[PDB]
């Protein structure tokens, strides 16, 4: 089902190349945006870390700049390693170093969002961005709202202790998405609630959406262990949230859903985006004629013609 992960990785690389083309490359492909209120914002950070592998997160985060995570299927690679594009060609083995570096970027604080790239075999390639969660506060909200508007596959996490209505995350998710078509929900911190409790949250009708909600508890060999606990815990109250139950939970199903949504939405945006690139290629090509007669040029060919003219003059 390899062909499958692959469509996404090809698109993610293409998302990067649109992002990098140039000034008028207003054009881009969508991606996952992640919002969460404070307890919920903490649940969301935890979750992002947990989805793949431990990474520097939380503690004290100014949350002023977004972090564009781009993941890569890492089969044939046996070392968990993450690299920064602006810090090009550098690979980082231990995430503690990635803690020091990105969190000092966190204390430096333009609004530009740092790009990131991590390769790990258990992780499926994705393209999520983590912006600061809701708690000056106005200005953070302002960025959040602007990012949510555009058709990115958004959404939300919500801690089990808070009422669903009370949480800003799902509340803005509903504000910018009335239909709930492009937004997925996650109920975190679910470990300390009765199974009656998971049932009412994991499945609700007060606020229905497509792609459903996903409940999970996130928090060496940490991956597998977080997996182990999810496999182990539901056994406590299996009938309340397990097979054939309407709710869905644990990190893996939530991930494959993420794969599906991302492949589908991106694929919708591909047409309009592509005609856009053909229009900007035609603009660049036409300017290439009016300016410099479309001839290929290198700096050495320029340098040769002058040097030559100078020697005959000097003679």
């Amino acid at each position: 089902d390899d062909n499958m992960m692959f469509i996404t990785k090809k698109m993610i690389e293409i998302r990067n190349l649109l992002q990098k083309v140039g000034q008028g490359s207003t054009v881009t492909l969508p991606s996952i945006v992640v919002i969460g209120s404070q307890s919920s914002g903490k649940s969301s950070v935890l979750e992002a870390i947990v989805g793949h592998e431990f990474l520097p997160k939380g503690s004290n985060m100014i949350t002023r700049r977004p972090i564009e995570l781009t993941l890569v299927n890492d089969p044939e690679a046996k070392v968990d390693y993450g690299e920064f594009p602006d810090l090009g060609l550098a690979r980082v083995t231990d995430f503690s170093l990635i803690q020091k570096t990105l969190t000092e970027l966190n204390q430096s604080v333009t609004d530009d969002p740092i790009r990131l790239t991590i390769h790990s075999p258990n992780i499926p390639d994705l393209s999520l961005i983590d912006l600061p969660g809701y708690i000056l506060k106005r200005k953070i909200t302002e960025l959040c709202d602007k990012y949510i508007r555009g058709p990115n596959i958004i959404l939300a996490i919500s801690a089990a202790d808070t009422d669903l209505a009370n949480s800003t995350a799902l509340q803005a998710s509903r504000r910018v998405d009335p239909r709930g078509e492009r937004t997925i929900g996650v109920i975190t911190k679910m470990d300390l609630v009765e199974p009656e409790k998971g049932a009412a949250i994991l499945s609700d009708r007060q606020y229905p959406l497509k792609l459903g909600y996903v409940g999970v508890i996130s928090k060496g060999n940490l991956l597998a262990s977080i997996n182990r606990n999810e496999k182990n815990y539901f056994g406590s109250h299996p009938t309340e949230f397990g097979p054939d139950s309407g709710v869905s939970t644990g990190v893996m199903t939530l991930r494959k859903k993420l794969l599906q949504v991302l492949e589908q939405q991106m694929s919708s945006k591909l047409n309009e985006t592509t005609e856009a690139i053909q229009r900007e290629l035609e603009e660049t090509t036409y300017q290439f004629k009016v300016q410099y007669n479309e001839q290929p040029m290198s700096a050495e060919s320029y340098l040769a013609a002058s040097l030559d003219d100078f020697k005959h003059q000097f003679h």
Binding site: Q278, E282, T285, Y286, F288, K289, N293, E294
Partner: protein, 99 residues
């Protein structure tokens, strides 16, 4: 009887028409004007089709534009266009025969 009736020149006109519409597709996307909203246009503005006849030959919206138009037309899924058009013709004639 229909298979003895059908043959090839039917395909001829069929593919020649769809490649015409593709010709209209290329020409517009590469040469002509675009939709209108209150938003002001791209400038552009050396790309005026009118000074095409009495122009000097080495001008792109001429040279490079035609050049990329033909490269684009040939390196388009003409293979897949013929396939699907012959597909929808044969499919139609079998649905006419079923009536």
């Amino acid at each position: 009887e229909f298979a003895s009736s059908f043959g090839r020149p039917q395909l001829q006109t069929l593919l020649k028409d769809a490649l015409d519409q593709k010709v209209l597709d290329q020409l517009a996307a590469r040469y002509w004007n675009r939709p209108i909203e209150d938003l002001s246009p791209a400038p552009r503005e050396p790309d005026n089709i009118i000074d095409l006849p009495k122009a000097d030959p080495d001008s792109p919206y001429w040279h490079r534009q035609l050049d990329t138009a033909c490269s684009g037309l040939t390196r388009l899924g003409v293979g897949r266009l013929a396939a699907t058009v012959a597909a929808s013709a044969i499919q139609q004639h079998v649905e006419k025969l079923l009536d």
